[PDB]
Structure 1
């Protein structure tokens, strides 16, 4: 456009123009977005960031593509709103795709704005949050749009383990675009959002299978089946609340430990812990009741709550300090570890280590889930991920053995040989290489040739599988009264808050795939 004649007029022209840009795709498209139960790109940033803290970069930034109508197309902010702000006074950088603008298709300039914003986040050591709502790379831009995605993925990896990256899918996310969220640390999906590498149209044409976007890549599908996301949100409002709650446990970057939040310094006994875990190995329970009674105010944000529920991973705090809790869930699949739970735990453990969050595990595992599909699905390589993650982790590692701790599944839950700094055994702790029955059936195979098994099983069980034997060997530091758990963990965390562990020089180890 042509500039006005005076400075007052130009300031007015500027306000007018900015108003246009901010209207995105227009009132109708905006009403449509709203009718679908979705907030706009700007509304989401306004609700997420502290009031008036949004400092936008690139409102007037425009695409430079000219092919297939782009030369005449008006595309506000090239479809993405980027900038910095604060969440609870903490500086952050964020991006938000505007679906009302060419379906939020990722223009080349749009991805460039996102990468620049990510670089600023890295440069200043601040978290990065991105609201996705897009039809994928902008088709009219061909390889220019494709290149933008390549730059984005490289950036997600560059920031990985340096500054927290949170993705929020609040609408479509069609195609490889989805690899960006996968490369961030946490994905939050609303119930209006969708995500997939290959869409229903292509899948039907190619495989003959006709499914809906919701069955294929809706939030529930990704959470329970795919194992791709960490939180499901009812709508944008709840996703924003989740994003904030999540961020409160995380430091600004990898050079700091998260700031303590509303500490409960009380660590007196709580006999209620003695009853949650049945002395009868045949009876289960919800391990989260144990957690609730150990963490400050019983508060915890469970990660991947609806995935591989046989294992629980959740952020919580002890004396105001962020910690990551990894716990076997006996009330589900007997608390067995399996392919999916190995992945769920490993990712969590790795993330906590990258950001200096101590790890607390509550152990009650009978072993890995038996089954042909588990072997066929690579339980060997997926299970190795837990052993690797814990063995590589240098943050404080505190382990409490609640009940069963059998063979490899017990090592996977981080015992002292895997670098646990403190290990405690409850009086119902049953640490063994294998159940006494199957063990007896092996080492006494001959001498039993009947009912002779009874004495042998018993004898084996008493020689090794008792809390006192584990303690006798030094595998646990002490056998404790379950009511003192919170206090022992708290004291351990306090002492190891200054832990400085050395690791051999390497670009990186070989993390199992």
Structure 2
């Protein structure tokens, strides 16, 4: 029996209001700017590299991915803004690698492809970080992965950042071994020459496909062999699809053109013999009752103005149906249950500065969801944190610890979205990047940093004032603005969404309009991994 009608969230924002107009204009400006940049990134290494790559007869990586996936299906690229102005003068579109999740032969699987157009497929440090992030996502979600190797090797001028360290290059192979150990499939496809970077990968993978001419599997390149052993020989003699197939046996299959390799890959995936099963109650799904684009006028591009979360929730969940939990108590925070694309979810969001009561409410909600095996989604807009003499007297920090412990010990899949400004230890509290959320995204407006620039400028001013007063020449009235200005500027630069997305702190920058769609895709993939028991540490009263 499901005949009871339920109240729906959200209202109709006043379009005629000048505030809505202003917010809309700001959000359009940001979205347009993002779109133009993404176009320029997708062009890749540049026209000349494309001309040469075509001249060899290979297919450009974007074309390869389009042919590989089940046609007419969505594909979810990740961290497209990697390496955006990260290095001093070297243009590295997309980090010289394309990674994503797609549906192939009816089974979700992660695709990782080199981009030989960009810098000959050399592994920049960011490239390794991006690839490892993809692999860990696949393992947690328990998804098969496919590699499309056209890489040369590690970037020589930066060897310290690539080779030695634990999380550095080579950890890739370790993950590969662990994946194959616990039945997660591995497939490697070779389209280009490889020198010790794409040489172990086919040997490391269970299955192997190599194109007849353009594919060569060799541990040491012809220049490396010539320089090291004093002997020169073409990589085909060390590599080659036919040469390796007849005698070496490294290649399990022998393809002629790029299309043939893709088709064979589809056949292998079908033969993989895996079936997905769910363990959560499912229901029919319906669209939210309100248009999504209104969010622009609701949110704007200023962190100062405040927007109620429930408006956004109405714009997202199925049918705009929501059941708030302990609404009156701890109003600064919002929790409740909802359904997205027929899947149950628990929504946690921020309205204002946290207090002790909000922390207690969040802890109780987390326990409930973990007990009932319900996925969790976080919408954090932490304009301020819990600071105050009365607050610390009653151990508001202790309540914050309760947030941290509950979030950390949780085992159900967790997804986080940074709708608004994130600062302070609340990032740790509301399932930050460090707390291993399955995904993480940021809207084009959000700014993330440890503290607002003004706060740090004031704090530094005071500490210098106190110590220099102890030194006899206190921080003078002059230099106050001179000292403050650089701190504000630097914090602004480090808080920019592109700046963080240049590194891999986030999985991607998404416009608000696409939000709903992305979430559904993510949750579907996350459901592949079976749910497990959640065990909690000591709950300090």
TM-score for the superposition, normalised by structure 1: 0.46
Tell me: higher relative CO, structure 1 or 2? Use CA pairs within 8 A at least 6 residues apart. Answer: 2
TM-score norm. by structure 2 comes to 0.44
